[PDB]
């Protein structure tokens, strides 16, 4: 039942984001209300999380493949739908496996950003 | 001089009188036979019902009394017995499962059950090491009602056995009973959780083996014989006399049990 409900919620959110894309392209993201903004952000994160590198795609991509489990996927998607990962950077879900890898990539991105900002301030 | 403690737990007056006559005739009056309800040594308990003060309920397949059908089989069936209170009072095996649902505290009961399970696991692992087997089989009733007592039994038994160094395989009741009655040679040591179903399975195994006397280990420390039929009671009396130090009498009683199970007293 958890799998079914998560799938249905994901489909509804993606459909709503697809519908709202047209308004975004006509009136701008600012015109949308806060609820629509949250839905848009969550939908983009879901879209980027659905991406998954393959162990046979090393030559095409240049990165190690990932194997994900059904329970891990369901739990991660449920958390994302509930909003447990709103503060996470959007790009962290791109070309990754589970939520653990997502958090590791977010940590790496934060560390690199802090180092780059420190260098810029030093300049 | 010496005393033999006869305990009755759900036994028939006919079987009790048969046992009394057998012991009197065989001993000749040297060792008196006193009736009581609890003992730690030189005690024989007649009747399916478990007596008071017993924590281990081991039984084996004696070589002398092997049935022709089950000749050569070697498996040790040990049942764990929780402390028994008065019949009116709630037994531990049921209190530990009902108080949890009711919300009542179950600390002392849990501790007592843990002590009993640890003793039973120690006896079972000792038997397994003596036999040379590497893995034992735990038997737990899968009834949804017994979702706490069985869990505690499994946890404690597996912890103790893993600490000792042997392996454990958990199973239900119906499948294990069918295996023990059809192909018992595939099981070396089987421990049973404290349940009426396990007690009945142990009794059925003892009966189908051809009639044997079970051994009960009490908190006081020792071994007491247990029987439920005429042949089982005769074997228990023979073993008790052998323990007392009577070999010829024990052999005669064993021969009478093997020959005329239902009328051993007249046979000897």
């Amino acid at each position: 039942v958890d799998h079914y409900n998560v799938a249905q919620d994901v489909v509804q959110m993606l459909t709503k984001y697809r519908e709202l894309q047209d308004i975004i392209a006509v009136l701008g993201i600012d015109e949308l209300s806060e609820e629509d903004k949250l839905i848009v952000d969550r939908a983009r994160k879901l879209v980027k999380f659905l991406s998954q590198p393959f162990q046979v795609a090393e030559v095409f991509t240049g990165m190690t493949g990932h194997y994900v489990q059904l329970d891990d996927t369901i739990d991660s998607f449920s958390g994302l739908l509930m909003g447990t990962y709103d503060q996470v950077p959007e790009m962290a879900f791109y070309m990754v496996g589970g939520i653990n890898s997502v958090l590791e990539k977010a940590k790496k991105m934060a560390e690199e950003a802090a180092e780059l900002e420190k260098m810029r301030r030093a300049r | 001089s010496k005393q033999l403690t006869f305990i009755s737990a759900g036994a028939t007056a006919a079987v009790l009188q048969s046992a009394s006559a057998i012991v009197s005739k065989v001993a000749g009056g040297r060792v008196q036979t006193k009736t009581a309800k609890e003992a730690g040594r030189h005690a024989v308990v007649v009747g399916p019902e478990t007596p008071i003060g017993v924590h281990t309920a081991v039984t084996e397949v004696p070589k002398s009394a092997q049935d022709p059908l089950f000749s050569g089989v070697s498996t040790v069936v040990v049942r764990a017995v929780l402390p028994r209170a008065a019949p009116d009072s709630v037994q531990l095996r049921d209190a530990l499962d009902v108080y949890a649902s009711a919300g009542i505290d179950t600390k002392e009961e849990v501790r007592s059950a843990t002590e009993a399970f640890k003793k039973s696991a120690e006896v079972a692992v000792g038997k397994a090491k003596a036999k040379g087997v590497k893995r034992i089989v735990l038997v737990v009733k899968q009834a949804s009602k017994h979702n706490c007592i069985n869990e505690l039994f499994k946890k404690i038994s597996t912890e103790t056995i893993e600490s000792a160094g042997l392996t454990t395989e958990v199973v239900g009741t119906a499948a294990v009973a069918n295996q023990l009655i059809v192909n018992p040679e595939s099981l070396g040591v089987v421990l049973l959780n404290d349940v009426a179903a396990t007690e009945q399975i142990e009794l059925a195994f003892a009966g189908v083996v051809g009639g044997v006397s079970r051994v009960y280990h009490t908190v006081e420390g020792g071994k007491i014989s247990a029987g439920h039929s005429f042949k089982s009671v005769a074997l228990a009396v023979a073993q008790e006399l052998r323990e007392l130090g009577l070999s010829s009498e024990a052999d005669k009683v064993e021969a009478a049990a093997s020959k005329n199970p239902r009328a051993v007293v007249s046979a000897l």
């Binding site: - | 899968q142 009834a143 949804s144 009602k145 239900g172 009741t173 119906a174 499948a175 009973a177 179903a197």
Partner: protein
């Protein structure tokens, strides 16, 4: 000469949940009777 028999397949015994009569006693002991029914179904599925 085919389609003879499977042998190693046993149909699962379809359990039937025990049904109690509608009475004040049933209402009072709903929990106990339902627990008995659950135990019966579990025993049916587990054999004994």
């Amino acid at each position: 000469r085919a389609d003879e028999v499977d042998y190693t397949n046993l149909p699962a015994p379809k359990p039937q949940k025990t049904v109690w009569d509608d009475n004040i006693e049933t209402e009072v002991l709903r929990k106990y009777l339902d627990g008995l029914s659950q135990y019966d179904m579990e025993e049916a599925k587990y054999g004994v």
